[PDB]
Amino acid sequence: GIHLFWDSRVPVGLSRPVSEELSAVLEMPVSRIDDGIFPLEGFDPVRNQYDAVKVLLKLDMFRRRMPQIFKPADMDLEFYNKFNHLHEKILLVTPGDLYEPLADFVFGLAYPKLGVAIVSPHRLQNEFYGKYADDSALIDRIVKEGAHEIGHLFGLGHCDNPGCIMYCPRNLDELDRKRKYFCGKCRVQLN
Ligand SMILES: [Fe+3]
Numbered sequence: 141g142i143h144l145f146w147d148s149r150v151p152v153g154l155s156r157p158v159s160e161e162l163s164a165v166l167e168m169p170v171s172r173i174d175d176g177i178f179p180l181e182g183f184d185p186v187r188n189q190y191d192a193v194k195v196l197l198k199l200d201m202f203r204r205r206m207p208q209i210f211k212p213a214d215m216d217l218e219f220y221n222k223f224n225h226l227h228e229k230i231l232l233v234t235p236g237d238l239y240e241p242l243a244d245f246v247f248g249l250a251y252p253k254l255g256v257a258i259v260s261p262h263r264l265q266n267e268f269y270g271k272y273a274d275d276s277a278l279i280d281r282i283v284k285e286g287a288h289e290i291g292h293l294f295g296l297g298h299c300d301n302p303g304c305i306m307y308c309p310r311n312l313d314e315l316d317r318k319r320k321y322f323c324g325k326c327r328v329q330l331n
Pocket residue numbers: 299300301304305306307322323324325326
């Protein structure tokens with residue numbers, strides 16, 4: 141299953157549309173959790189950013205500890221304990237600004253081996269750039285970078301086609317040029 145864990149500090153009114161467009165572009169059912177925060181880990185005071193690798197490990201631990209949330213009713217509890225990362229993929233939508241060791245920042249990150257991914261609207265929001273709110277733009281961006289990260293969870297790498305969801309954006313302008321679209325090469329792999 142695919143679970144959108146929407147940190148409620150991100151405007152929860154955007155939750156449902158993001159969930160529905162993620163589901164359409166992935167062509168897969170996506171369940172929405174948007175009634176709670178996910179306190180982040182691995183904060184770096186000099187950077188003023190959070191280590192996304194640590195958050196992702198914490199996310200796996202949370203899933204394993206929370207059968208009552210993520211385990212399908214028809215799934216044995218012991219099977220879930222061993223295999224939750226194969227079956228219940230999670231995308232965390234967090235307000236925190238993210239980095240990884242090799243990068244000044246990231247819009248998101250995936251840990252394919254543990255079936256967990258993360259996207260941060262912190263640099264996707266118009267407001268980060270001193271521009272007025274634009275809910276549709278923010279939905280567009282989260283969907284595109286969210287489907288990207290989730291694609292990784294299914295084994296896809298970065299794509300060369302700049303309009304494809306799997307393309308890796310260097311900046312916000314490149315991200316906005318991506319379309320809600322998996323190219324031919326990527327759809328075959330994703331299937
Ligand atoms: Fe592609």
